[PDB]
């Protein structure tokens with residue numbers, strides 16, 4: 001194999017893979033409508049990137065890799081089949097990187113990316129220079145992915161469209177399994193659970209599963225997993241148990257109980273009980289591998305996190321923003337499921353009890369807003385000040401009653417918060433600027449467009465332009 005071409009090379013997922021393959025010496029080609037930092041970096045490494053989707057782009061390719069976001073109509077794909085050039089999905093290419101490596105695949109509905117980042121830090125510190133492919137930018141490395149010199153591959157495993165079923169790992173983690181909607185058809189959620197079981201059965205017989213016993217669905221699935229399992233959680237029956245948890249600012253402090261080890265004291269550079277869970281998963285894997293406690297503890301105290309995961313972008317003075325004294329703290333989170341938003345709020349609340357929580361939220365998709373409406377209203381009602389942008393459609397047509405204004409009505413009608421509707425993405429900075437007080441903790445929360453707003457708020461220090 002010589003020339004790999006990626007349709008949608010600019011997105012997360014595709015970019016990391018392309019970068020690892022470039023460093024291994026393969027010829028790399030790609031396409032994307034929106035050039036970004038990832039596409040520039042790929043061009044720096046020798047890849048040829050096109051900012052359009054045309055059939056000429058697939059010429060001489062040994063294989064064409066496609067993300068699930070591309071439509072079957074894409075001329076690159078069409079042109080590929082015409083030429084009888086194999087076309088595979090992102091996940092099949094990730095599977096090939098894992099083929100001759102000691103794969104550690106991290107799955108779950110929430111926490112996958114963070115847990116993958118925590119494992120990568122531990123293995124790097126232990127001098128095991130791992131190859132890794134993560135769904136978020138690993139801040140310690142400045143990238144989503146890196147080629148390592150060892151046989152290890154640490155990677156996030158995506159359950160969407162059962163992509164993770166192509167992976168053949170040696171170790172697999174399941175952080176939790178939660179529905180993001182009610183069953184459209186009888187057995188919808190049961191089907192999803194079965195794919196996780198099928199994923200774990202991709203482990204060889206001598207392989208290992210690390211599962212969160214605190215998650216009700218994961219606990220219920222244990223008996224059906226015919227593989228060696230190591231459980232973790234605050235639960236009393238956990239193989240790796242968290243206890244004496246307390247949060248101090250951005251840091252978590254707790255003990256971990258493991259078999260044939262005395263209690264260890266951990267200081268984690270990430271906030272919240274949910275990050276303690278993610279860390280426990282990582283430590284469980286690290287311990288079965290034989291990594292020393294000093295390497296583990298140093299990795300966790302120094303953890304640098306991932307882009308857009310409770311990402312502190314700065315404390316900025318308000319005088320030039322709205323003429324008030326003091327400063328405001330800017331935190332960026334991509335969390336989009338009500339569980340994710342709630343965990344972020346809890347971390348901010350527990351970490352900085354005296355700060356006022358100001359959230360700028362952008363719901364992602366009408367289907368999801370409609371499906372988890374009640375949960376969004378309950379979770380969003382917990383902040384002190386709420387600003388809401390219009391639902392990020394992600395290609396979907398609107399659903400009446402499942403929009404930001406409706407959600408704002410439901411929350412306001414409870415008589416505690418008076419949410420602020422932000423009619424524009426361009427108006428967000430001004431409307432935020434106007435209500436900021438000293439000692440505010442701002443959560444720019446959401447998976448779509450809001451990511452750019454966060455970046456710009458940081459670049460301009462909260463000053464409207």
Ligand SMILES: Nc1ncnc2c1ncn2[C@@H]1O[C@H](COP(=O)(O)O)[C@@H](O)[C@H]1O
Nearest residue numbers: 110111112113114274277335340343344
């Ligand atoms: N173990 C967990 N359980 C629930 N939510 C989590 C967990 N870990 C991270 N999160 C939330 O999910 C988002 C990040 O997840 P991820 O990108 O998968 O690490 C953030 O909003 C976190 O608040």
